[PDB]
Structures are given as C-alpha cells and as structure tokens.
Structure 1
C-alpha cells in the first residue's frame, strides 16, 4: 500500500493502512514523509509501542532534509540513494534494474542496444558530476529518462523487426532512436543550445 504524505486524508489513510498491515503482514510505503515532521515524530512514537506481523515492512521514502526527526532516524534503518560512484557502478545498476527477460527478446540485437543505452546513461550521469564542464547546469537525468529510452528502443525495434530472430545492423532504426533521445527523452530537460 503506497501512500503520498501531505494531506490530512493522507494521514488517515496511512494510519489505517499501517493498522491493517501490522495484523495482515502487508507492506506499507509512505512517500515524501519529510513534509510532515511532527507526524513523523508521532509515527515513530506509535511504531515503538507495537508488535507487528513477521512479514510486515514499513518503507518511508524521503529526501535528505534537516527537518526529519532525529528519533525517527535512530529508530529506523537508513538507506541513502544517490548517483552511483563510477561508470562501472552506474552500468551495473542499470543492468540490475532492467529485467533479464526484457533484454533477452526475439531480436538478438536488443542486448547490444540496451548496453549502448546503459553506457550512454552512465556517461551522461557522470558528466553531470562536473557541472561547469560536463554540462551547463545540474540536469535531472535519472531513472525515468532511462526507462523512457528503453521503452522507445523496445517499441521501435519491435516495429522494425516483425518478430524476426535476427536483424541487420543497417536495418536498425538508428534515426528514430537518435531523434527521440535528442528531442524527447533526454533532450527535453536541456534548455541550452
């Protein structure tokens, strides 16, 4: 049960979902919890005096903000999500996130295209580290752009290869991929010539 924090009805739904899940052993996720710090303190105090089910899990997804309570930070286990350190790490994360079945489809050239996408995403994200030189500003090139690019590659490869096992590299719609990545998927966030 995924609930976005920020509304009073949101708090009611979060309380109801947690109360149901501690008995039913269900997972509850609460997003953007950093916008309700006092409610975070109340939630931590409620969580301490509780005996939930064995399989129950409560994920609280937030951004690193100085407003989160210290008690909540000490009560829970913290996982920090940030850009992967190296190009190798970024490519490993990209390959692990993408399911194996999606890459291994009917065209044998889909794996090469997915590897090219992974390398390009890693290069762009690491150039983002050096803001003055790599780009002109800190663009938000993230997992959403990678997912959109993967969906575009899948769609256009399926359109070009009508279920054929193998496709010639010359027949791959390079123009479609390049144009959609430069204008729509990755080039949307770019506001500089």
Structure 2
C-alpha cells in the first residue's frame, strides 16, 4: 500500500493502512514524509508501541532534510540513495535495474544497444560531478530518462 504524504486524508489512509498491515503482514510505504515532521514524530511514537506481524514492513521515502526528527532516524534503519560513485557502479546499477528478459529479446542486437545506452547514461550523470565543465548546470538526468 503506497501512500503520498501531505494531506489529512493522506494521514488517515496511512494510519488505516498501518493498522491493517501490522496484523495482516502486508507492506506499507509512505512517500515524501519529510513534509510533515510532526506527524512523523507521532508516527514513530505509534510504531514504538507495536508488536506487528513478522512479514510487516514499513518504508518511508524521504529526501535528505534537516527537518526530519532525529527520533525517527534513530528508530529506523537508514539507506542513502545518491549518484553511483563511478562509471562502473553506474553501469552495474543500470544493468541490475533492467530485467534480464527485457534485454534478452529476440533481436540479438538489442542487448548491445542497451549496453551503449547504459554507457551513455553512465557518462552524462558522471559529468554532473564537475558542475562548470561537465555541463553548465546540474541537470536532473535521472532514472526516468
């Protein structure tokens, strides 16, 4: 159950989804939770006093922001997503993201094309680390492109 945070009905949906999933064991995901730090505080307090199902999981997607309460940061485990360190890591991530079935399609050339694409992608984002020289500004060349 994926929910975008930012509205009161969104908060109600998040509360209901968590309440049903802690019993049923499904996964709950809340995006952009950095936009309501107080509600994050009460959410962490509610999470502390729970004995949920074994398979229950809660994902909180946030952008790196000081307004995030440190109580929630200590309560949970943090994973940082950012540009891959280098060309090799970028290409590895790109190849991991694409399913093997998609790349291995009946036109045998397709894979090579994908490889080329990956390389090109892994180039341009890398040039973003050199802001004045690689480009003229920090374009948002991301996974959607």
TM-score (normalizing by structure 2): 1.00
Return the index of the structure with the highest Cα Rg: 1
Partner of 1:58: 58
- Cα deviation, residue 47, structure 1: 0.2
* C-alpha distance in structure 2 between counterparts of 1:24 and 1:102, whole Å: 34
- Cα deviation, residue 17, structure 1: 0.2
Query: What is the Cα-based RMSD across aligned positions, in Å?
Result: 0.3
- Cα deviation, residue 59, structure 1: 0.1
- Cα deviation, residue 121, structure 1: 0.3
* C-alpha distance in structure 2 between counterparts of 1:29 and 1:117, whole Å: 31
CA deviations over 1:133-160 (Å, ceiling 9, x no partner): 0000000000000xxxxxxxxxxxxxxx
- Cα deviation, residue 46, structure 1: 0.1
CA deviations over 1:62-92 (Å, ceiling 9, x no partner): 0000000000000000000000001000000
- Cα deviation, residue 31, structure 1: 0.2
Where relative contact order (Cα < 8 A, 6+ residues apart) is larger, the structure is: 2
- Count of residues in correspondence between the two structures: 145
- Cα deviation, residue 53, structure 1: 0.4
- Cα deviation, residue 119, structure 1: 0.2
- Cα deviation, residue 111, structure 1: 0.4
- Cα deviation, residue 122, structure 1: 0.4
- Cα deviation, residue 103, structure 1: 0.2
Unaligned segments of structure 2, at least 5 residues:
none
- Cα deviation, residue 21, structure 1: 0.3
- Cα deviation, residue 7, structure 1: 0.1
- 3-state SS of the aligned residue for 2:144? helix
- 3-state SS of the aligned residue for 1:20? helix
TM-score (normalizing by structure 1): 0.75
